[PDB]
Design a protein around this ligand. Structure first.
Ligand SMILES: [Mg+2]
Ligand SMILES: [Mg+2]
Ligand SMILES: [Mg+2]
Ligand SMILES: [Mg+2]
Ligand SMILES: [Mg+2]
Ligand SMILES: [Mg+2]
Ligand SMILES: [Mg+2]
Ligand SMILES: [Mg+2]
Ligand SMILES: [Mg+2]
Ligand SMILES: [Mg+2]
Ligand SMILES: [Mg+2]
Ligand SMILES: [Mg+2]
Ligand SMILES: [Mg+2]
Ligand SMILES: [Mg+2]
Ligand SMILES: [Mg+2]
Ligand SMILES: [Mg+2]
Ligand SMILES: [Mg+2]
Ligand SMILES: [Mg+2]
Ligand SMILES: [Mg+2]
Ligand SMILES: [Mg+2]
Ligand SMILES: [Mg+2]
Ligand SMILES: [Mg+2]
Ligand SMILES: [Mg+2]
Ligand SMILES: [Mg+2]
Ligand SMILES: [Mg+2]
Ligand SMILES: [Mg+2]
Ligand SMILES: [Mg+2]
Ligand SMILES: [Mg+2]
Ligand SMILES: [Mg+2]
Ligand SMILES: [Mg+2]
Ligand SMILES: [Mg+2]
Ligand SMILES: [Mg+2]
Lengths: 150, 129, 141
RNA sequence: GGCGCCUAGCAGCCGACUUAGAACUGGUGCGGACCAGGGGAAUCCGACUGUUUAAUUAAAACAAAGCAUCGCGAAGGCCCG
RNA sequence: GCGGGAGUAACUAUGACUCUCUUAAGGUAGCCAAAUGCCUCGUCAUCUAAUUAGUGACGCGCAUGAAGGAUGAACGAGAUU
RNA sequence: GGUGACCACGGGUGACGGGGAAUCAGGGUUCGAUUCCGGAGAGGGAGCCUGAGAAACGGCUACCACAUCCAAGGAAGGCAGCAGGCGCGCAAAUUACCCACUCCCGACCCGGGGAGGUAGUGACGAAAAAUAACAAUACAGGACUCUUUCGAGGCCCUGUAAUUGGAAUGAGUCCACUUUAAAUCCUUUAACGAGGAUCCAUUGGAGGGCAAGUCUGGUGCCAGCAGCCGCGGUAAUUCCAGCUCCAAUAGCGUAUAUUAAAGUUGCUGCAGUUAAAAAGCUCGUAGUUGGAUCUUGGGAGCGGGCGUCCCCGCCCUCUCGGCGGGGCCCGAAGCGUUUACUUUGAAAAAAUUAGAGUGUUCAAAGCAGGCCCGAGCCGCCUGGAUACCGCAGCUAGGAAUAAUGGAAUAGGACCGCGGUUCUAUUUUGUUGGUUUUCGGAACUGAGGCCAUGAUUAAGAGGGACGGCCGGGGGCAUUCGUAUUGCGCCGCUAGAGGUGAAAUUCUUGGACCGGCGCAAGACGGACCAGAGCGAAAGCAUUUGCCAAGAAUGUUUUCAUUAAUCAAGAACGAAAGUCGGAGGUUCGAAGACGAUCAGAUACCGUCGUAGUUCCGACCAUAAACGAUGCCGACCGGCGAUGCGGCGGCGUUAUUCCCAUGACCCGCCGGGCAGCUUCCGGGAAACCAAAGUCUUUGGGUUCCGGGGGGAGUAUGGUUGCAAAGCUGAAACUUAAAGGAAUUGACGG
RNA sequence: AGAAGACGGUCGAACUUGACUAUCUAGAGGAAGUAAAAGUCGUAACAAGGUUUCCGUAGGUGAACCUGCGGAAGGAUCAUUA
């Protein structure tokens, strides 16, 4: 079920049993890596890079075709984002909700959603500090988080 | 969330056996499940089982022979010494003439009779009769 | 359900000793206020001085005058009411006697049709009421 | 300028008051004069601060913030003349 | 501004209750021998050796009572034990 | 600084701790003042001398409380040692004898020991075990037999009562021996010692539970019995008695603590819709619990018989192998993680527990004992085992399960090669000069090689993205009639309201009709066992603002998760505070009716409120009277959303798209029907199933009914009140579901 | 070699005083809960209990209770037609 919702959805992705690269794919590992580099310089997060690569260039799995994941490739080249993608998007959502709430004081539904989002932020930050992705003293401040996103 | 894969598999086998199905599919496979099923198959309580191998955790399809009464689990894997194995045995088994207790030992996963035969204790896994 | 983890013994024992206060026997035996309220002070028998001789009406379905004595215990000076349990043993009871009183059967609870009486007289003036009733020995004149 | 490592900071000079501690000591006396709250438990009234019968009443009286009511849209309400 | 008279509970005593007469409405919540109670130095308790004093309590209250009633810290050259 | 929700600190203990005791399926629950070990104290404290050892008390000093003598000047005290008194009590023994045993002390074979031993009291409790046995007559009974009921004796077993009727023994009197320090007791042994063998068995019962009387006489809801149901009000199976029976038996009853019964504390192993019970809802830290994945199969003769069983052999490295230079062998160093776990070994006082041996006359006991002795045995054979002893600590095998780590900015492993600073010993033996790269350690630069190094991507989760979807939320805006009030116009005498009336409004034009105006509420019908939201809740239009489930995904991260004490957000209505507004309805209040009364139900009016903004409160039958996450276990037809695939109809258009229908499939929801899945006390429930065949993870919470959600304390609040929350006492039922009947304005 | 005695220090009993904390306990008056009397008044609940019952909240009344607002069915409706 969902972390903060009473939903039990099943919509997922079914990765095929064939890990091999399709024969009709003419892109080589370095070619896909250069495409990822260009998209990352354009500013796309790894999820968007994967979506563009799958939709347009016909590559099924970057890991299958290159042997490495998109974030691993970006970090190896040295242009991975300072914050993780999901944590960044959670902070962005929290900033948007706070900006709405400071004008709509009666939006108690928005206050409840804000509490849920900030709980998710703190749990994810705890995970990242455990994995040493984030600095050990990293803390999400509601006041200063607005300058980190958008 | 699912925290005891063996417990889920054993409950599925028990329910299919009670309903009278000829085959049962248990979705999360593991080495512990395969060893438990191997013990049951060597004692003849189940038929052949085949492992469908996906790149994730595999699935198992077991042929039920219809001669199983219960295949429950002891979820907290208590440490079982040879001095209290008899108390576990007469607490969990229907009689002293049949029924087996599977416990994971240092020598491997095996029933209580073999555990006593080669003189070792271990952690309780489950039972079947 | 209940917790079953390998290291849940602290919670199990804490919950057990919290819930053990909710039955009347454990509460009575371990709170101490019942012991303080008990006139005997946790003793099987007690001695007292007969303050008075009284009659107690039986309960609603019955109709009788149960013969009791109002007795002040020698220790702690508490005043209780004790049934005199035979046909004519009230005649062997007079004022200022030193009587021995025991429980009346069910641990500080009233018995039968006698309301609010939890004790009965066993001996008077250091001679047994059974002995006096059977005539095996005489009042100490 | 080739020419060296105070970098755990040193050297010299100068300077107010204040606090804390210790020893000794006097016939237990020491905030030695001066300066300088007796205290507690309650009852009544007034909330408080303020004001008052100069020349017998400083109060519980008056005032007060707070509360409530009333009149009046200017050719008007209230008042002087 | 905010009432009377009668009867009434298995000991007595009160009167939950019931009759009537009457009012514009019959004094409600509260509070009391109070700075408001004649009788009165009321009755009971406490304070004392002894208290017309004080406090607490009671209330058919001569003649308590709601923009004023009842409380409640802080304060007072206020009255009292 | 140190310690704390892994419970510190504080309080209580009717707490000395342990070995152990009671109970006894397993698990446990209670008790250990008490003879063994350890500790503490000597009326309460405190301070000391001596001595190796004392903060000693049968040592001292002082104070306090008691208390002895006194010639009143002083002096002397410490039985929680042995006895023995008083007091307290429900509650516990003789002011006895002895150092004879076991040991202790001393200068010591010799003395002393209220340690200790012996005896006395002793129904604390435990073991054994009398109160009778036999025979012969009568009267019965037997599968009895002899002729087929008839009658008897070639048999057996009871009971009734007797001049039976003579055999055996003790309990007692009591000589001696024995025992013993001396006695006592036991065991021996003289002599007396039994026929109501009067040498006398009792304690509780006879309605049920629960074995035993529907006997008789008294009493008459009295006396009394009765643990509980109940008995007794004049024919008592229950009281008081007689008789007869029942149970245990030298013991039995009663009271109280405690254990089992109690699966009514539930770890094993309870429950939580309706019986008592799941928090209003969500988040959330401690706590608890966490997906899959890393060595498997192949070998040889011993081999649970390659006897294709398999005791089983397995087909770590480097250092002097102790039998500076042998293969004749096994020792010094380390573990290519750290643990949990399991097995073994050690170390774990005795007694007690279990248990081996042993005829104590048997047994409880005890740790003894047994073999021959022809009399010379100028003495032989033994035993005084073993098991268990939790947890913690130590050691050695195993490596399944579970935790934990190694190489990702390579700051990685391994083979070497540069360039660095010191030094135990060198011996380039006369000392001194010493060269010592000598040997290894000191840092440091460039290489080779590692298959160089990242498990997979959960019908776990988070996040991105796409098209939607929705009375989800907030802000603004728009509209609708209705109601009420008002202003004009018309005509009229009633209108309203009710069961009936009446209060009320009305020739002042009430009601009614028409046209307008104003205000504040409210969003009908559409509107559903439909949707959304964590719940509370959410329904006129349009716009804006953020949010969200589900779906689709060959996107991304890679375990980030589930439940959660403490804490936090929201939380209908009513209620509170401040400001606006106040149409309707309408607590309080007033009146009219009804009635025996009517503080009500009905009617008329009407304050607070109902509306909006801001701030409190935190409660509801806040309900599904039903925790959340996860898996499994029937069928069917629908419905909402999203997606996918199909004959066709329809919308325009020239065809496909895209809408509206039709037929299906998938996923997530609200539900419904049906079923001997199964459960349940049943009602009923596809969950309230997968539960004695009992264990997926986790939170809260109940323990007969009342007292009582009360008192008190704490805490929150402006208040109302909210949260936490007893006890005394009382009671034998209170309750749930179903059945039959009776009753129903 | 040395006794009495004294200054000081240190352990420090004990007494007085005050504070805190435990129990036990008196108390005018007030306000409850249990039990028994066919005591008085009414008849709120069980049937549609004669105004369906009940929950939360607020006000009021001799008393049970009544009334307003929101909720529940544990209801007296599992249902009401295009
Ligand atoms: Mg003043
Ligand atoms: Mg004031
Ligand atoms: Mg002046
Ligand atoms: Mg003056
Ligand atoms: Mg003056
Ligand atoms: Mg005021
Ligand atoms: Mg009055
Ligand atoms: Mg008065
Ligand atoms: Mg006066
Ligand atoms: Mg005076
Ligand atoms: Mg007074
Ligand atoms: Mg009063
Ligand atoms: Mg003690
Ligand atoms: Mg002890
Ligand atoms: Mg001792
Ligand atoms: Mg001592
Ligand atoms: Mg001493
Ligand atoms: Mg006898
Ligand atoms: Mg009898
Ligand atoms: Mg028991
Ligand atoms: Mg139960
Ligand atoms: Mg219930
Ligand atoms: Mg947590
Ligand atoms: Mg695992
Ligand atoms: Mg009218
Ligand atoms: Mg509200
Ligand atoms: Mg207001
Ligand atoms: Mg009205
Ligand atoms: Mg759980
Ligand atoms: Mg109870
Ligand atoms: Mg009613
Ligand atoms: Mg009614």
């Amino acid at each position: 079920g969902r972390m903060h919702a009473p939903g039990k959805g099943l919509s997922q992705s079914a990765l095929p049993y064939r890990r091999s690269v399709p024969t009709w794919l003419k892109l080589t590992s370095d070619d896909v890596k250069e495409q990822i580099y260009k998209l990352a310089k354009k500013g796309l997060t790894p999820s968007q890079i994967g979506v563009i690569l799958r939709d347009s260039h016909g590559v099924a799995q970057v890991r299958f075709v290159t042997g490495n994941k998109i974030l691993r490739i970006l970090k190896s080249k040295g242009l991975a984002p300072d914050l993780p993608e999901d944590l960044y998007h959670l902070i962005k959502k929290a900033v948007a909700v706070r900006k709405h709430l400071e004008r709509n004081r009666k939006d108690k539904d928005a206050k409840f959603r804000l509490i849920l989002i900030e709980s998710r932020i703190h749990r994810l930050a705890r995970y990242y500090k455990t994995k040493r992705v984030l600095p050990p003293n990293w803390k999400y401040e509601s006041s200063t988080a607005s300058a980190l996103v958008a | 969330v699912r925290m005891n894969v063996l417990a889920d598999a054993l409950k599925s086998i028990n329910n299919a056996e009670k309903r009278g199905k000829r085959q049962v599919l248990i979705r999360p496979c593991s080495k512990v499940i395969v060893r438990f099923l191997t013990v049951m198959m060597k004692h003849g309580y189940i038929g052949e089982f085949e492992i469908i191998d996906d790149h994730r955790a595999g699935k198992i399809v077991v042929n039920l022979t219809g001669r199983l009464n219960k295949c429950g689990v002891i979820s907290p894997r208590f440490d079982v010494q040879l001095k209290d194995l008899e108390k576990w045995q007469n607490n969990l088994l229907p009689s002293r003439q049949f029924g087996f207790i599977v416990l994971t030992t240092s020598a491997g996963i095996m029933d209580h009779e073999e555990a006593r035969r080669k003189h070792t204790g271990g952690k309780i896994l489950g039972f079947f009769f | 359900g209940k917790c079953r983890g390998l290291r849940t013994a602290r919670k199990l024992r804490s919950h057990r000793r919290d819930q053990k206060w909710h039955d009347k026997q454990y509460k009575k035996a371990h709170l101490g206020t019942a012991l303080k309220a008990n006139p005997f002070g946790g003793a099987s028998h007690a001695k007292g001085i007969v303050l008075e001789k009284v009659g107690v009406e039986a309960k609603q379905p019955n109709s009788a005058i149960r013969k009791c004595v109002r007795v002040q215990l020698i220790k702690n000076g508490k005043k209780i009411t004790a049934f005199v349990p035979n046909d004519g043993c009230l005649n062997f009871i007079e004022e200022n006697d030193e009587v021995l009183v025991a429980g009346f059967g069910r641990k500080g609870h009233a018995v039968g049709d006698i309301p609010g009486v939890r004790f009965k007289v066993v001996k008077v003036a250091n001679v047994s009421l059974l002995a006096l009733y059977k005539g095996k020995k005489e009042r100490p004149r």
